[model samples]
Target chain A: SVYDAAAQLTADVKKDLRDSWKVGSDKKGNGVALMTTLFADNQETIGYFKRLGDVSQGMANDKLRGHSITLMYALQNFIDQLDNPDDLVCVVEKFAVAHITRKISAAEFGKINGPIKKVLASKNFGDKYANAWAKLVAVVQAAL
Target chain B: SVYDAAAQLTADVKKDLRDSWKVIGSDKKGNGVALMTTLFADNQETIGYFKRLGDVSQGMANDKLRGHSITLMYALQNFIDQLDNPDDLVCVVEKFAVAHITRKISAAEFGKINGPIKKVLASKNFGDKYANAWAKLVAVVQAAL
Candidate 1:
Protein backbone atom coordinates (compact mmCIF):
# COMPACT_ATOMS: atom_id res chain seq x y z
CA SER A 1 0.00 0.00 0.00
CA VAL A 2 2.76 2.45 0.90
CA TYR A 3 4.69 1.40 -2.17
CA ASP A 4 1.70 1.97 -4.43
CA ALA A 5 1.09 5.38 -2.96
CA ALA A 6 4.74 6.29 -3.21
CA ALA A 7 4.95 5.28 -6.85
CA GLN A 8 1.89 7.28 -7.79
CA LEU A 9 3.10 10.27 -5.83
CA THR A 10 6.57 10.15 -7.37
CA ALA A 11 5.09 9.99 -10.86
CA ASP A 12 2.79 12.89 -10.15
CA VAL A 13 5.59 15.10 -8.82
CA LYS A 14 7.85 14.26 -11.73
CA LYS A 15 5.02 15.15 -14.08
CA ASP A 16 4.52 18.48 -12.36
CA LEU A 17 8.17 19.45 -12.69
CA ARG A 18 8.31 18.28 -16.28
CA ASP A 19 5.17 20.20 -17.17
CA SER A 20 6.44 23.39 -15.49
CA TRP A 21 9.73 23.45 -17.32
CA LYS A 22 8.25 22.21 -20.62
CA VAL A 23 5.98 25.17 -21.21
CA GLY A 24 8.29 28.18 -20.80
CA SER A 25 11.87 28.46 -19.85
CA ASP A 26 11.92 29.10 -16.11
CA LYS A 27 15.41 29.70 -17.47
CA LYS A 28 14.75 33.42 -16.85
CA GLY A 29 17.64 35.80 -17.59
CA ASN A 30 20.24 33.18 -16.73
CA GLY A 31 20.47 32.46 -20.50
CA VAL A 32 22.48 29.59 -22.02
CA ALA A 33 25.72 30.12 -20.10
CA LEU A 34 24.01 30.40 -16.74
CA MET A 35 21.91 27.33 -17.51
CA THR A 36 25.02 25.50 -18.58
CA THR A 37 26.86 26.39 -15.41
CA LEU A 38 23.85 25.50 -13.29
CA PHE A 39 23.58 22.14 -15.01
CA ALA A 40 27.31 21.57 -14.69
CA ASP A 41 27.23 22.37 -11.00
CA ASN A 42 24.25 20.10 -10.69
CA GLN A 43 25.89 17.16 -12.38
CA GLU A 44 26.75 15.80 -8.96
CA THR A 45 23.15 16.18 -7.94
CA ILE A 46 22.13 14.34 -11.10
CA GLY A 47 24.54 11.56 -10.29
CA TYR A 48 23.04 11.34 -6.82
CA PHE A 49 19.67 10.61 -8.39
CA LYS A 50 21.25 8.05 -10.70
CA ARG A 51 22.61 6.17 -7.70
CA LEU A 52 19.23 6.57 -6.09
CA GLY A 53 17.71 5.00 -9.16
CA ASP A 54 19.95 2.01 -8.68
CA VAL A 55 19.20 1.78 -4.97
CA SER A 56 15.49 2.23 -5.58
CA GLN A 57 15.49 -0.48 -8.17
CA GLY A 58 17.36 -2.74 -5.81
CA MET A 59 14.84 -2.13 -3.01
CA ALA A 60 11.89 -2.75 -5.33
CA ASN A 61 13.23 -6.14 -6.31
CA ASP A 62 13.90 -7.11 -2.73
CA LYS A 63 10.23 -6.85 -1.71
CA LEU A 64 11.03 -3.84 0.44
CA ARG A 65 9.00 -1.61 -1.82
CA GLY A 66 7.22 0.28 0.94
CA HIS A 67 10.26 2.38 1.64
CA SER A 68 9.87 4.00 -1.75
CA ILE A 69 7.34 6.42 -0.29
CA THR A 70 10.08 8.02 1.75
CA LEU A 71 12.35 8.19 -1.27
CA MET A 72 9.57 9.76 -3.32
CA TYR A 73 9.10 12.36 -0.65
CA ALA A 74 12.82 13.17 -0.68
CA LEU A 75 13.11 13.30 -4.47
CA GLN A 76 10.02 15.44 -4.69
CA ASN A 77 11.56 17.80 -2.16
CA PHE A 78 14.58 18.19 -4.39
CA ILE A 79 12.50 18.53 -7.53
CA ASP A 80 10.23 20.97 -5.77
CA GLN A 81 13.16 23.20 -4.92
CA LEU A 82 14.18 23.24 -8.56
CA ASP A 83 10.70 23.83 -10.00
CA ASN A 84 7.77 24.14 -7.60
CA PRO A 85 8.82 24.63 -3.98
CA ASP A 86 5.31 24.90 -2.60
CA ASP A 87 4.22 21.62 -4.04
CA LEU A 88 7.39 20.00 -2.82
CA VAL A 89 6.90 21.05 0.81
CA CYS A 90 3.25 20.04 0.69
CA VAL A 91 4.23 16.59 -0.46
CA VAL A 92 6.95 16.39 2.16
CA GLU A 93 4.57 17.35 4.95
CA LYS A 94 2.10 14.75 3.76
CA PHE A 95 4.86 12.18 3.71
CA ALA A 96 5.95 13.15 7.20
CA VAL A 97 2.40 12.79 8.46
CA ALA A 98 2.16 9.34 7.04
CA HIS A 99 5.52 8.42 8.47
CA ILE A 100 4.57 9.42 12.00
CA THR A 101 1.02 8.08 11.98
CA ARG A 102 2.10 4.81 10.45
CA LYS A 103 4.48 4.19 13.32
CA ILE A 104 7.47 4.28 11.00
CA SER A 105 10.52 3.56 13.12
CA ALA A 106 13.23 6.10 13.73
CA ALA A 107 15.72 3.81 12.04
CA GLU A 108 13.79 3.82 8.78
CA PHE A 109 13.47 7.56 9.21
CA GLY A 110 17.23 7.72 9.68
CA LYS A 111 17.87 5.56 6.66
CA ILE A 112 15.98 7.90 4.38
CA ASN A 113 17.41 10.99 5.99
CA GLY A 114 20.90 9.83 5.08
CA PRO A 115 20.50 10.15 1.32
CA ILE A 116 18.59 13.44 1.34
CA LYS A 117 21.30 15.36 3.19
CA LYS A 118 24.06 13.83 1.12
CA VAL A 119 22.45 14.88 -2.13
CA LEU A 120 21.64 18.38 -0.90
CA ALA A 121 25.02 19.01 0.66
CA SER A 122 26.78 17.85 -2.50
CA LYS A 123 25.37 20.88 -4.34
CA ASN A 124 27.47 23.18 -2.17
CA PHE A 125 24.48 25.48 -2.05
CA GLY A 126 24.26 27.71 0.98
CA ASP A 127 21.37 28.31 3.38
CA LYS A 128 20.49 31.40 1.39
CA TYR A 129 19.75 29.18 -1.56
CA ALA A 130 17.68 26.92 0.65
CA ASN A 131 16.00 30.01 2.04
CA ALA A 132 14.97 31.04 -1.44
CA TRP A 133 13.65 27.53 -1.90
CA ALA A 134 11.93 27.82 1.46
CA LYS A 135 9.39 30.17 -0.12
CA LEU A 136 7.97 27.11 -1.84
CA VAL A 137 8.32 24.95 1.24
CA ALA A 138 6.44 27.55 3.26
CA VAL A 139 3.55 27.63 0.82
CA VAL A 140 3.46 23.85 0.72
CA GLN A 141 3.53 23.47 4.47
CA ALA A 142 0.82 26.07 4.88
CA ALA A 143 -1.40 24.11 2.51
CA LEU A 144 -0.87 20.98 4.56
CA SER B 1 42.96 13.48 9.50
CA VAL B 2 40.24 13.05 6.92
CA TYR B 3 40.19 9.35 7.60
CA ASP B 4 40.09 10.01 11.30
CA ALA B 5 37.26 12.51 10.87
CA ALA B 6 35.30 10.23 8.60
CA ALA B 7 35.97 7.24 10.78
CA GLN B 8 34.73 9.25 13.71
CA LEU B 9 31.69 10.73 11.99
CA THR B 10 30.55 9.23 8.70
CA ALA B 11 31.76 5.63 8.33
CA ASP B 12 29.50 4.11 10.98
CA VAL B 13 26.34 5.71 9.62
CA LYS B 14 27.17 4.62 6.09
CA LYS B 15 28.09 1.14 7.29
CA ASP B 16 24.77 0.71 9.06
CA LEU B 17 22.74 1.32 5.92
CA ARG B 18 25.20 -0.38 3.58
CA ASP B 19 25.34 -3.52 5.69
CA SER B 20 21.60 -3.61 6.12
CA TRP B 21 20.99 -2.97 2.46
CA LYS B 22 23.66 -5.50 1.55
CA VAL B 23 22.02 -8.17 3.70
CA ILE B 24 18.53 -7.39 2.46
CA GLY B 25 19.74 -7.18 -1.12
CA SER B 26 21.90 -10.26 -0.72
CA ASP B 27 18.76 -12.36 -0.59
CA LYS B 28 19.21 -12.45 -4.37
CA LYS B 29 21.38 -10.90 -7.05
CA GLY B 30 19.02 -7.99 -7.58
CA ASN B 31 17.79 -7.91 -4.03
CA GLY B 32 19.42 -4.53 -3.83
CA VAL B 33 16.33 -3.41 -5.66
CA ALA B 34 14.40 -3.66 -2.43
CA LEU B 35 16.61 -0.98 -0.93
CA MET B 36 15.82 1.35 -3.78
CA THR B 37 12.10 0.67 -3.63
CA THR B 38 11.92 1.26 0.07
CA LEU B 39 13.92 4.44 -0.34
CA PHE B 40 11.79 5.82 -3.16
CA ALA B 41 8.56 4.86 -1.49
CA ASP B 42 9.43 6.74 1.66
CA ASN B 43 11.76 9.25 0.05
CA GLN B 44 10.99 12.12 2.38
CA GLU B 45 11.75 10.74 5.82
CA THR B 46 13.52 7.56 4.84
CA ILE B 47 15.94 8.65 2.14
CA GLY B 48 19.37 10.00 3.09
CA TYR B 49 22.77 10.16 1.39
CA PHE B 50 23.78 7.88 -1.47
CA LYS B 51 21.28 9.75 -3.59
CA ARG B 52 23.90 10.06 -6.32
CA LEU B 53 27.37 9.07 -7.47
CA GLY B 54 29.11 11.69 -5.36
CA ASP B 55 27.49 10.43 -2.19
CA VAL B 56 28.47 6.89 -3.07
CA SER B 57 31.99 8.04 -3.81
CA GLN B 58 32.06 9.99 -0.57
CA GLY B 59 30.94 6.92 1.30
CA MET B 60 33.60 4.89 -0.39
CA ALA B 61 36.44 7.38 -0.02
CA ASN B 62 35.82 9.85 2.76
CA ASP B 63 35.75 7.99 6.05
CA LYS B 64 34.44 11.14 7.74
CA LEU B 65 31.67 11.85 5.23
CA ARG B 66 29.08 9.79 7.12
CA GLY B 67 25.52 9.83 5.90
CA HIS B 68 22.58 11.69 7.52
CA SER B 69 22.84 13.07 11.01
CA ILE B 70 19.14 13.01 11.87
CA THR B 71 18.80 9.39 10.81
CA LEU B 72 21.62 8.38 13.11
CA MET B 73 20.05 10.46 15.84
CA TYR B 74 16.67 8.89 15.32
CA ALA B 75 18.06 5.37 15.01
CA LEU B 76 19.77 5.76 18.35
CA GLN B 77 16.54 7.12 19.77
CA ASN B 78 14.77 4.09 18.34
CA PHE B 79 17.27 1.90 20.15
CA ILE B 80 16.47 3.80 23.31
CA ASP B 81 12.81 3.17 22.66
CA GLN B 82 13.28 -0.54 23.29
CA LEU B 83 14.92 -0.46 26.64
CA ASP B 84 13.36 -2.63 29.37
CA ASN B 85 15.66 -1.43 32.05
CA PRO B 86 16.18 2.09 33.34
CA ASP B 87 19.91 1.64 33.10
CA ASP B 88 19.56 0.94 29.39
CA LEU B 89 18.28 4.48 28.94
CA VAL B 90 21.52 5.92 30.16
CA CYS B 91 23.57 3.20 28.53
CA VAL B 92 21.94 3.77 25.18
CA VAL B 93 22.50 7.52 25.40
CA GLU B 94 26.10 7.07 26.39
CA LYS B 95 26.69 4.55 23.67
CA PHE B 96 24.91 6.69 21.12
CA ALA B 97 27.03 9.74 21.89
CA VAL B 98 30.17 7.70 22.06
CA ALA B 99 29.23 6.16 18.75
CA HIS B 100 29.80 9.57 17.12
CA ILE B 101 31.96 11.54 19.48
CA THR B 102 34.77 11.15 16.90
CA ARG B 103 37.39 10.95 19.59
CA LYS B 104 36.27 8.03 21.73
CA ILE B 105 34.96 4.56 20.89
CA SER B 106 36.34 5.00 17.39
CA ALA B 107 37.52 1.37 17.17
CA ALA B 108 34.71 -0.34 19.10
CA GLU B 109 32.01 1.38 17.08
CA PHE B 110 33.20 -0.36 13.95
CA GLY B 111 31.96 -3.76 15.11
CA LYS B 112 28.31 -4.82 15.07
CA ILE B 113 25.92 -5.28 17.97
CA ASN B 114 25.19 -8.98 18.02
CA GLY B 115 24.15 -11.07 21.05
CA PRO B 116 20.80 -9.53 21.94
CA ILE B 117 20.10 -8.23 18.44
CA LYS B 118 20.19 -11.67 16.79
CA LYS B 119 16.83 -12.47 18.31
CA VAL B 120 15.12 -9.38 16.97
CA LEU B 121 15.83 -9.39 13.19
CA ALA B 122 12.82 -11.23 11.77
CA SER B 123 9.73 -10.30 9.74
CA LYS B 124 7.62 -7.55 11.36
CA ASN B 125 9.94 -7.76 14.32
CA PHE B 126 10.76 -4.15 15.25
CA GLY B 127 12.97 -5.37 18.03
CA ASP B 128 14.94 -7.53 15.65
CA LYS B 129 15.50 -4.68 13.26
CA TYR B 130 16.74 -2.48 16.06
CA ALA B 131 18.86 -5.22 17.57
CA ASN B 132 20.30 -6.38 14.29
CA ALA B 133 21.22 -2.82 13.33
CA TRP B 134 22.77 -2.32 16.72
CA ALA B 135 24.77 -5.52 16.40
CA LYS B 136 26.45 -4.36 13.22
CA LEU B 137 26.72 -0.98 14.91
CA VAL B 138 28.92 -2.36 17.66
CA ALA B 139 31.82 -2.64 15.27
CA VAL B 140 31.47 1.04 14.51
CA VAL B 141 31.57 2.03 18.14
CA GLN B 142 34.12 -0.35 19.55
CA ALA B 143 36.58 0.38 16.75
CA ALA B 144 39.20 -1.75 18.43
CA LEU B 145 37.07 -4.85 17.98
Candidate 2:
Protein backbone atom coordinates (compact mmCIF):
# COMPACT_ATOMS: atom_id res chain seq x y z
CA SER A 1 0.00 0.00 0.00
CA VAL A 2 2.86 2.38 0.82
CA TYR A 3 4.47 1.66 -2.54
CA ASP A 4 1.31 2.51 -4.49
CA ALA A 5 0.68 5.52 -2.32
CA ALA A 6 4.20 6.84 -2.92
CA ALA A 7 3.85 6.37 -6.69
CA GLN A 8 0.49 8.13 -6.72
CA LEU A 9 1.84 10.99 -4.67
CA THR A 10 4.83 11.36 -6.93
CA ALA A 11 2.66 11.48 -10.04
CA ASP A 12 0.28 14.03 -8.49
CA VAL A 13 3.16 16.20 -7.30
CA LYS A 14 4.68 16.42 -10.75
CA LYS A 15 1.35 17.14 -12.44
CA ASP A 16 0.33 19.81 -9.99
CA LEU A 17 3.71 21.46 -10.08
CA ARG A 18 3.76 21.52 -13.84
CA ASP A 19 0.27 22.94 -13.84
CA SER A 20 1.29 25.66 -11.42
CA TRP A 21 4.36 26.53 -13.49
CA LYS A 22 2.30 26.69 -16.68
CA VAL A 23 -0.14 29.08 -15.06
CA GLY A 24 2.57 31.36 -13.70
CA SER A 25 4.57 31.18 -16.92
CA ASP A 26 1.68 32.26 -19.14
CA LYS A 27 2.47 35.95 -18.68
CA LYS A 28 6.01 36.97 -19.56
CA GLY A 29 7.89 38.75 -16.71
CA ASN A 30 5.11 38.02 -14.23
CA GLY A 31 7.05 35.35 -12.30
CA VAL A 32 10.29 37.37 -12.16
CA ALA A 33 8.31 40.47 -11.20
CA LEU A 34 7.23 38.66 -8.07
CA MET A 35 10.88 37.77 -7.30
CA THR A 36 11.83 41.49 -7.29
CA THR A 37 9.09 42.10 -4.76
CA LEU A 38 10.29 39.19 -2.66
CA PHE A 39 13.81 40.62 -2.73
CA ALA A 40 12.71 44.16 -1.86
CA ASP A 41 10.60 42.99 1.06
CA ASN A 42 13.48 40.98 2.48
CA GLN A 43 16.46 43.26 2.93
CA GLU A 44 18.88 40.44 3.76
CA THR A 45 18.10 38.39 0.64
CA ILE A 46 18.37 41.44 -1.59
CA GLY A 47 21.64 42.36 0.14
CA TYR A 48 23.01 38.87 -0.52
CA PHE A 49 22.25 39.20 -4.23
CA LYS A 50 23.58 42.76 -4.33
CA ARG A 51 26.86 41.63 -2.73
CA LEU A 52 27.44 39.26 -5.66
CA GLY A 53 28.37 42.43 -7.63
CA ASP A 54 26.11 41.58 -10.54
CA VAL A 55 23.23 43.89 -9.72
CA SER A 56 23.02 47.49 -10.94
CA GLN A 57 23.28 50.85 -9.11
CA GLY A 58 19.56 51.32 -8.70
CA MET A 59 17.54 48.83 -6.62
CA ALA A 60 15.37 48.14 -9.66
CA ASN A 61 17.49 47.64 -12.74
CA ASP A 62 18.17 45.36 -15.72
CA LYS A 63 20.84 43.47 -13.82
CA LEU A 64 18.23 42.44 -11.30
CA ARG A 65 15.86 42.01 -14.25
CA GLY A 66 18.37 39.72 -15.92
CA HIS A 67 18.86 37.69 -12.77
CA SER A 68 15.16 37.29 -12.08
CA ILE A 69 14.46 36.10 -15.61
CA THR A 70 17.56 33.92 -15.66
CA LEU A 71 16.62 32.22 -12.39
CA MET A 72 12.97 31.68 -13.37
CA TYR A 73 13.94 30.09 -16.68
CA ALA A 74 16.55 27.97 -14.94
CA LEU A 75 13.87 26.56 -12.67
CA GLN A 76 11.61 25.89 -15.67
CA ASN A 77 14.53 24.28 -17.48
CA PHE A 78 15.22 21.96 -14.54
CA ILE A 79 11.58 20.92 -14.26
CA ASP A 80 11.34 20.21 -17.99
CA GLN A 81 14.45 18.03 -17.85
CA LEU A 82 13.54 16.03 -14.74
CA ASP A 83 12.97 12.87 -16.75
CA ASN A 84 16.56 13.06 -17.94
CA PRO A 85 18.58 12.48 -14.75
CA ASP A 86 21.93 13.50 -16.22
CA ASP A 87 20.50 16.74 -17.61
CA LEU A 88 18.71 17.56 -14.37
CA VAL A 89 21.87 17.36 -12.27
CA CYS A 90 23.98 19.18 -14.84
CA VAL A 91 21.54 22.10 -14.84
CA VAL A 92 21.53 22.28 -11.04
CA GLU A 93 25.32 21.93 -10.77
CA LYS A 94 25.91 24.79 -13.21
CA PHE A 95 24.14 27.20 -10.85
CA ALA A 96 26.02 25.73 -7.87
CA VAL A 97 29.33 26.24 -9.63
CA ALA A 98 28.31 29.81 -10.47
CA HIS A 99 27.31 30.72 -6.88
CA ILE A 100 30.27 28.87 -5.36
CA THR A 101 32.63 30.85 -7.59
CA ARG A 102 31.13 34.04 -6.14
CA LYS A 103 32.40 32.97 -2.66
CA ILE A 104 28.91 32.13 -1.42
CA SER A 105 29.47 29.31 1.01
CA ALA A 106 26.98 26.47 1.35
CA ALA A 107 25.71 28.00 4.57
CA GLU A 108 25.10 31.34 2.90
CA PHE A 109 23.33 29.66 0.01
CA GLY A 110 20.96 28.11 2.57
CA LYS A 111 19.50 31.54 3.25
CA ILE A 112 17.69 31.55 -0.15
CA ASN A 113 15.22 29.00 1.22
CA GLY A 114 13.16 31.56 3.10
CA PRO A 115 12.58 34.07 0.28
CA ILE A 116 12.10 31.40 -2.40
CA LYS A 117 9.49 29.60 -0.30
CA LYS A 118 7.88 32.89 0.53
CA VAL A 119 7.61 33.71 -3.17
CA LEU A 120 6.10 30.30 -3.95
CA ALA A 121 3.62 30.73 -1.12
CA SER A 122 2.64 34.04 -2.68
CA LYS A 123 1.85 32.19 -5.93
CA ASN A 124 -0.73 30.09 -4.06
CA PHE A 125 0.14 26.94 -6.01
CA GLY A 126 -1.44 24.98 -3.12
CA ASP A 127 -0.04 22.28 -0.83
CA LYS A 128 0.86 19.73 -3.50
CA TYR A 129 2.83 22.22 -5.61
CA ALA A 130 4.33 23.69 -2.47
CA ASN A 131 5.63 20.27 -1.42
CA ALA A 132 6.96 19.71 -4.94
CA TRP A 133 8.65 23.13 -4.88
CA ALA A 134 10.32 22.20 -1.60
CA LYS A 135 11.64 19.00 -3.13
CA LEU A 136 12.97 20.89 -6.18
CA VAL A 137 14.63 23.56 -4.04
CA ALA A 138 16.20 20.80 -1.91
CA VAL A 139 17.72 19.34 -5.02
CA VAL A 140 19.00 22.82 -5.93
CA GLN A 141 20.38 23.37 -2.39
CA ALA A 142 22.08 19.99 -2.40
CA ALA A 143 23.91 20.96 -5.54
CA LEU A 144 25.05 24.20 -3.90
CA SER B 1 34.66 61.32 -57.22
CA VAL B 2 37.76 60.40 -55.19
CA TYR B 3 37.12 63.39 -52.85
CA ASP B 4 33.91 61.83 -51.39
CA ALA B 5 34.92 58.12 -51.91
CA ALA B 6 36.38 57.46 -48.42
CA ALA B 7 33.40 58.88 -46.52
CA GLN B 8 30.78 57.08 -48.67
CA LEU B 9 32.33 53.59 -48.46
CA THR B 10 32.84 53.71 -44.69
CA ALA B 11 29.14 54.31 -43.98
CA ASP B 12 27.95 51.45 -46.24
CA VAL B 13 29.88 48.65 -44.55
CA LYS B 14 27.43 46.40 -42.60
CA LYS B 15 24.65 43.81 -42.68
CA ASP B 16 22.60 42.84 -39.62
CA LEU B 17 24.33 39.63 -38.48
CA ARG B 18 20.99 38.09 -37.62
CA ASP B 19 19.77 38.68 -41.17
CA SER B 20 22.78 36.89 -42.64
CA TRP B 21 22.15 33.95 -40.28
CA LYS B 22 18.68 33.13 -41.62
CA VAL B 23 20.07 32.22 -45.05
CA ILE B 24 22.23 29.49 -43.47
CA GLY B 25 19.77 28.50 -40.74
CA SER B 26 17.24 27.59 -43.41
CA ASP B 27 19.43 24.58 -44.24
CA LYS B 28 20.88 23.71 -40.84
CA LYS B 29 21.33 19.96 -41.25
CA GLY B 30 22.95 20.18 -44.65
CA ASN B 31 25.19 23.04 -43.54
CA GLY B 32 25.97 21.26 -40.28
CA VAL B 33 26.99 18.07 -42.08
CA ALA B 34 29.20 20.06 -44.43
CA LEU B 35 30.87 21.82 -41.50
CA MET B 36 31.46 18.57 -39.57
CA THR B 37 32.78 16.80 -42.65
CA THR B 38 35.25 19.57 -43.33
CA LEU B 39 36.31 19.62 -39.69
CA PHE B 40 37.03 15.91 -39.60
CA ALA B 41 38.84 16.07 -42.92
CA ASP B 42 41.07 19.01 -42.06
CA ASN B 43 41.77 17.81 -38.52
CA GLN B 44 41.81 14.03 -38.55
CA GLU B 45 43.10 13.91 -34.97
CA THR B 46 39.85 15.40 -33.67
CA ILE B 47 37.90 12.34 -34.79
CA GLY B 48 39.36 10.34 -31.93
CA TYR B 49 37.43 12.46 -29.44
CA PHE B 50 34.17 10.89 -30.58
CA LYS B 51 34.85 7.46 -29.12
CA ARG B 52 31.23 6.47 -29.07
CA LEU B 53 31.23 6.26 -32.84
CA GLY B 54 34.38 4.19 -33.09
CA ASP B 55 36.49 3.81 -36.20
CA VAL B 56 35.09 6.78 -38.12
CA SER B 57 37.63 7.25 -40.87
CA GLN B 58 37.99 10.37 -42.99
CA GLY B 59 35.29 10.77 -45.70
CA MET B 60 33.12 8.21 -43.92
CA ALA B 61 29.36 8.87 -43.85
CA ASN B 62 27.35 7.26 -41.07
CA ASP B 63 24.06 7.70 -39.20
CA LYS B 64 25.90 8.69 -36.05
CA LEU B 65 27.63 11.58 -37.75
CA ARG B 66 24.43 12.63 -39.48
CA GLY B 67 22.48 12.68 -36.20
CA HIS B 68 25.17 14.66 -34.43
CA SER B 69 25.40 17.17 -37.24
CA ILE B 70 21.63 17.71 -37.19
CA THR B 71 21.72 18.29 -33.48
CA LEU B 72 24.67 20.65 -33.86
CA MET B 73 22.79 22.77 -36.36
CA TYR B 74 19.68 22.82 -34.17
CA ALA B 75 21.69 23.80 -31.12
CA LEU B 76 23.42 26.59 -33.02
CA GLN B 77 20.06 27.95 -34.11
CA ASN B 78 18.96 27.97 -30.49
CA PHE B 79 22.11 29.90 -29.48
CA ILE B 80 21.95 32.31 -32.41
CA ASP B 81 18.32 33.18 -31.74
CA GLN B 82 19.15 34.24 -28.19
CA LEU B 83 22.31 36.22 -29.01
CA ASP B 84 20.87 39.57 -27.91
CA ASN B 85 19.83 38.16 -24.54
CA PRO B 86 23.18 37.49 -22.91
CA ASP B 87 21.70 36.05 -19.74
CA ASP B 88 19.71 33.36 -21.53
CA LEU B 89 22.40 32.98 -24.16
CA VAL B 90 25.06 32.16 -21.57
CA CYS B 91 22.70 29.86 -19.73
CA VAL B 92 22.00 27.77 -22.85
CA VAL B 93 25.65 27.72 -23.84
CA GLU B 94 26.69 26.52 -20.37
CA LYS B 95 23.95 23.96 -20.44
CA PHE B 96 25.32 22.68 -23.73
CA ALA B 97 28.79 22.53 -22.22
CA VAL B 98 27.53 20.80 -19.08
CA ALA B 99 25.96 18.14 -21.27
CA HIS B 100 29.43 17.24 -22.48
CA ILE B 101 31.18 17.51 -19.11
CA THR B 102 30.25 13.95 -18.07
CA ARG B 103 31.91 12.62 -21.22
CA LYS B 104 35.22 14.35 -20.47
CA ILE B 105 34.96 16.57 -23.52
CA SER B 106 37.07 19.53 -22.53
CA ALA B 107 36.61 23.11 -23.75
CA ALA B 108 39.89 22.74 -25.63
CA GLU B 109 38.24 20.13 -27.81
CA PHE B 110 35.49 22.62 -28.58
CA GLY B 111 38.08 25.24 -29.39
CA LYS B 112 39.39 23.04 -32.17
CA ILE B 113 36.02 23.42 -33.95
CA ASN B 114 36.42 27.06 -35.07
CA GLY B 115 38.69 26.28 -37.99
CA PRO B 116 36.16 23.96 -39.61
CA ILE B 117 33.43 26.53 -39.07
CA LYS B 118 35.47 29.13 -40.91
CA LYS B 119 36.21 26.66 -43.66
CA VAL B 120 32.53 25.82 -44.04
CA LEU B 121 31.54 29.48 -44.27
CA ALA B 122 34.20 30.04 -46.89
CA SER B 123 32.90 27.11 -48.92
CA LYS B 124 29.37 28.51 -48.79
CA ASN B 125 30.64 31.85 -50.11
CA PHE B 126 29.08 33.44 -47.05
CA GLY B 127 31.76 36.14 -47.02
CA ASP B 128 32.65 38.40 -44.10
CA LYS B 129 29.08 38.81 -42.90
CA TYR B 130 28.31 35.12 -42.26
CA ALA B 131 31.87 34.32 -41.27
CA ASN B 132 32.00 37.11 -38.69
CA ALA B 133 28.58 36.18 -37.28
CA TRP B 134 29.41 32.49 -36.96
CA ALA B 135 32.78 33.40 -35.46
CA LYS B 136 31.02 35.43 -32.79
CA LEU B 137 28.75 32.46 -32.02
CA VAL B 138 31.73 30.05 -31.81
CA ALA B 139 33.59 32.41 -29.46
CA VAL B 140 30.70 32.25 -26.99
CA VAL B 141 30.55 28.46 -27.24
CA GLN B 142 34.31 28.20 -26.74
CA ALA B 143 34.13 30.34 -23.61
CA ALA B 144 31.37 28.20 -22.14
CA LEU B 145 33.05 24.98 -23.16
Give the top-scoring candidate (TM-score).
2
Report chain B TM per candidate. Answer: 0.23, 0.76
DockQ of each: 0.02, 0.05
DockQ of 2: 0.05
Candidate 1's residue-wise lDDT over B25-137, tens digit each? 22321222222333334443323433322332333132212213212323433332323332223333333444346333234322322432343234324455445455544
- What lDDT does model 1 reach? 0.34
- Tell how far residue B55 is off in model 2, in angstroms: 21
What overall lDDT goes with each candidate model? Answer: 0.34, 0.57
lDDT tens digits by residue: candidate 2, A32-89: 5555555565566566565334443333454454455445555666566555454455
- Model 1 interface DockQ: 0.02
Across residues B1-145, which tens digit of lDDT does each residue of candidate 2 receive?
Answer: 2112212212122234466566666665467678787777888877777765444453225545544565566567555545545555565566566567756776677767778776776766767666655655666656655
Per candidate, the number of residue pairs that clash is 79, 0
lDDT of 1 at A129: 38
Clashing pairs in 2: none
lDDT of model 1 at position B76: 39
